[PDB]
Design an enzyme around this catalytic site. Structure first.
Site, PDB file in Angstrom:
ATOM      1  N   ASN A 146       0.835  -1.189   0.000  1.00  0.00           N
ATOM      2  CA  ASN A 146       0.000   0.000   0.000  1.00  0.00           C
ATOM      3  C   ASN A 146       0.875   1.246   0.000  1.00  0.00           C
ATOM      4  O   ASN A 146       2.078   1.196   0.258  1.00  0.00           O
ATOM      5  CB  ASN A 146      -0.924  -0.025   1.213  1.00  0.00           C
ATOM      6  CG  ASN A 146      -1.863  -1.198   1.184  1.00  0.00           C
ATOM      7  OD1 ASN A 146      -1.813  -2.058   2.046  1.00  0.00           O
ATOM      8  ND2 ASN A 146      -2.722  -1.244   0.173  1.00  0.00           N
ATOM      9  N   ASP A 203      -0.936  -5.660   2.108  1.00  0.00           N
ATOM     10  CA  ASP A 203      -2.191  -6.397   2.130  1.00  0.00           C
ATOM     11  C   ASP A 203      -1.918  -7.851   1.764  1.00  0.00           C
ATOM     12  O   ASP A 203      -1.181  -8.126   0.813  1.00  0.00           O
ATOM     13  CB  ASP A 203      -3.157  -5.818   1.098  1.00  0.00           C
ATOM     14  CG  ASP A 203      -3.576  -4.425   1.405  1.00  0.00           C
ATOM     15  OD1 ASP A 203      -3.630  -4.042   2.577  1.00  0.00           O
ATOM     16  OD2 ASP A 203      -3.876  -3.703   0.446  1.00  0.00           O
TER      17      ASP A 203
END
Ligand SMILES: [Cl-]
Ligand code: NA
Length: 129
Positions: free
Chosen positions: A46, A52
């Site tokens: 990110n 993630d």
């Protein structure tokens, strides 16, 4: 593993996601297409520097520890790596806790940007019910 669509629909139902907090099964299946293209090994960076992880793309700043994200809270008491497995239990236990964090499925930007406001039933249409 890259889950088949109906294979993943079947698994998430087993763990009680169909209509969990009012979100029909298809919203979860829809989240899992667009977050990860159905792949338990998916990992992404990110900007904020967090990563993630996995099927739903659970984030390391709050939710699991990866050792490289400053200020991580590891609110699922878990190693982010364990969420890349082929067994989606940990990713569901954690996803149950995120969705319950007040903003609901809007915690998933691909759900907001792509699932929400759509006929999320096309995502399970053809699944043996
Ligand atoms: Cl809600
Ligand atoms: Na964390």
């Amino acid at each position: 593993k890259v889950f088949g669509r109906c294979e993943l629909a079947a698994a998430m139902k087993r763990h009680g996601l169909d209509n969990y907090r009012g979100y029909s099964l298809g919203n979860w299946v829809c989240a899992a297409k667009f977050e990860s293209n159905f792949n338990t090994q998916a990992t992404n960076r990110n900007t904020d520097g967090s990563t993630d992880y996995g099927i739903l793309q659970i984030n390391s700043r709050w939710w699991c520890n990866d050792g490289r994200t400053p200020g991580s809270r590891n609110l699922c008491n878990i190693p982010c790596s364990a969420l890349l497995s082929s067994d989606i239990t940990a990713s569901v236990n954690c996803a149950k806790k995120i969705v319950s964090d007040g903003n609901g499925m809007n915690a998933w930007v691909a759900w907001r940007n792509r699932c929400k406001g759509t006929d999320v039933q096309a995502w399970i249409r053809g699944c043996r019910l």
